[PDB]
């Protein structure tokens, strides 16, 4: 129950004002909107939330703003991971005290720890707040290192490590994890275009970007699937597929911020070193969004 | 009706006697076994049947023997592809007179034709026998070239091109094809571990290796899925996954031929330049099969 | 001495008439031109020679045409390899009798033999004509399988296996081969842009495509290097680099045939399934060639 | 003069005491050793120096200690990069007051900025300390993003950007940069196994790990090459290759720290989340070093 975050977890964007500061009021308005339109749980200051370029102070305040906003309607997972174990632990402890319902812990990027060091890293974070759920996040494309299924299988023996956001794109790996972990341990898709395929082999849901725009449709797809209406589910997947691709034509969260802007949200641009969507990206998104009546 | 091959297509091995010659008696006997145990359609002399090392006369003879062995009970698709278009055409013409129900046409290997060349290749084969169904076969890991979804989409406009055996591992690509092709055009998994995830996005089934051993459980998984018993399907998938992986621990069809031998089938070795399963491999296989009660 | 093929080995193109037949007279005129402009040895019916789409009869006749043309000025290596061991042996034997000075033996494409089977394949071909030099050809991008350094090191123990055309793009691998093979065993670059870097770690030269156009400059680069004029060599490399890339903007030998056509050679187009250079490719080549005063 | 760092830049390890704290005494002693044995310039707190897990105060302290230790004898380049541009700028400003001779600026890891974002990132760092040389560092395997040669070429137009540490393994990319940048802009190998091949196409030298152990032999190889003793250079390269590979058998700097320990240096372990060299690894190292007479 403490580990149940639903099926649609949205990695929320971080809106910025024109001066580049965090726009707390927009973040609140976005959080409430999401939670009323398909998001079960908000993942705050993930990758999509531009974590690398935020200060800790801005992260802390975002977690507080969202918790206040979505009190008793949605859970809140805090992006607290790092390629330094000590920094992750520090962040996790601070987030624990303000009331987050879990943390998202990325595999250490850039330094490429071996599996033994990855095991210790996640173990140490788990043990620093043994009652706080911990969601592993494997994204080799960004970190330069994959978390092996054997390592995940071992970490799932720690009671508060309650799942993995699997964004490797490798279904073999996801199935190896699923078949050797308990049911309290959940797999989430980390790519919107893989949600349906991963559901088919036992995943719980998705940590989504697209849910900012079509969260009610993702719910419908997942509920359709779980109730055995497999062709309704596939129809929705195939209909959304062009949007899912458009949302990664350049590095997330550049496209999603442009999409939201096209619907009138004042989310600002991304923060350096991320750069603004070029005209191409914007036009491709527009056409796809128009085709889906999102604008 | 004509492009309907069912859901389990088995890429049958080619058994050899101790002297290396084709064992037509075991071929027949294996074909009859398969078709009584889960296989809807037999794909003869594909990659799994060691097409590259067979003579054209051996392939012709196999087509005749299998077709006659299973006529009335199942269809036969003949592997007739090549990286020479003239050769593929000539093989396809001859298959058609034998009376087979379709051909499997690999993307040209080794020479890496551009998409325009691949389009013209397939079109010319389709046009040489305009009433014989033609199944595309995309396996970039072996050919060194990927068939693009735009190209597949254009090809599906040709009446007798009725599907693709998709062995790229790329589920976005498959989805792209599925959403832009008509329902007469079917997608088949080219990898047994991808059958369930591809089914979830609209694939028809699998061109399988594992069905030599667990055809009935594959039928059960696919039938469970289509009727909405999604957890029954994922249980089967997860239970079989170690077998699926073990069948690719070295290059197919080395493992599957060793798995068959463990069960008592006299299939012989593979032919040079494929070498025999070393002892580690056979031990891995034996353990997984024992655990599944296959020996 | 029997194994010395020089430093520039040119994988000659195969010119076709308008009706698509082999243009023997152009092949002769091209062979003589090459041998007078930097080519030490002609590699006939390689990949660049469109081997996969030629008949054996056309190959045999090309080997004869070239041998007659370049008698006592250049050696001739015959492309005789296959993914069937028996077919390679047959081809090698036939080529041996008409006087070729060696064979180029590609790693079996598409069927992905394990290393043990690759060892036996090349061993068997070597032993079928034990006095005929044999050049291994590793091109994983096209074959789907890499020949391991350990396997190459073992094959170099067979007296007539006198080197490898290394087109994997992996310099570690090339250095591992160099350091554990005798000096009678030579490494050749299989990519024109890697010739200089591979020379630096002990390669002999290149099996070149670009030599059709700048063979005298490649000689100058290699002679410059071997005489210790390293900056002359690097200058030539850097000056040719754009041509080297242009020659692979689409699949070789499509660009090189267009380049030759732009210089007035009547080489025809490629044979299906290879398709003609599109306008883009042609314009890019033109600009690069003009910039180098090749037209 | 100002961008001239010589040819061997050593990415020095950061030694730790048994309690995990930085060992400044060993740092000094190692710095002095290196600079007497082949190292022209020391790169401090790069990837090899475990930058990710050090505090900013530890890095500041290292910069001061090494600079003072080797002042008059060698230059010091400070690792100051980040995937936040504001952080890189602040670290760069502070390095400049310490009196270091340049900064090493990694491409932003994890967040995958588009090229326009990478251009703006680097430009802003360069502009924050316009008189401090800035060395680009491209290592896509760790960052998940490649710095394109067009982008590098534009950046080399900025006065103080004086080179790139190229660890992509892509020799075409390096050549593209070399031919389109002025001679004040230098290319350094980011991989010890690529030093010789990159030198052959116009690189200046290497930012090295192996120089901790064979700095003088690296100097000999590079000096041999530039004076045209090309076979002396390739002999050294080939002799060292097993060492180069062994230093990357698990993630750098795990092996190199174990190699140093085998020689008697008290460098400690790596810091979490990097784990200790298992026994197989240390045995591999020991054998190669024994064979090279390094222990
Ligand atoms: Mn942050
Ligand atoms: Mn943070
Ligand atoms: Mn909405
Ligand atoms: Mn049936
Ligand atoms: Mn055949
Ligand atoms: Mn055939
Ligand atoms: Mn019969
Ligand atoms: Mn041929
Ligand atoms: Mn042939
Ligand atoms: Mn010429
Ligand atoms: Mn010096
Ligand atoms: Mn630090
Ligand atoms: Mn730092
Ligand atoms: Mn001191």
Author numbering:
A (entry chain B), B (entry chain A), C (entry chain B), D (entry chain A): 0 to 294
Extract from the study:
The diaminopimelate pathway commences with the condensation of pyruvate and (S)-aspartate semialdehylde (ASA) to form (4S)-4-hydroxy-2,3,4,5-tetrahydro-(2S)-dipicolinic acid (HTPA). This reaction is catalysed by dihydrodipicolinate synthase (DHDPS) (EC4.3.3.7), which is the product of an essential gene in bacteria. The canonical bacterial DHDPS structure is a homotetramer best described as a ‘head-to-head’ dimer-of-dimers with four identical (β/α)8–barrel subunits 3725.
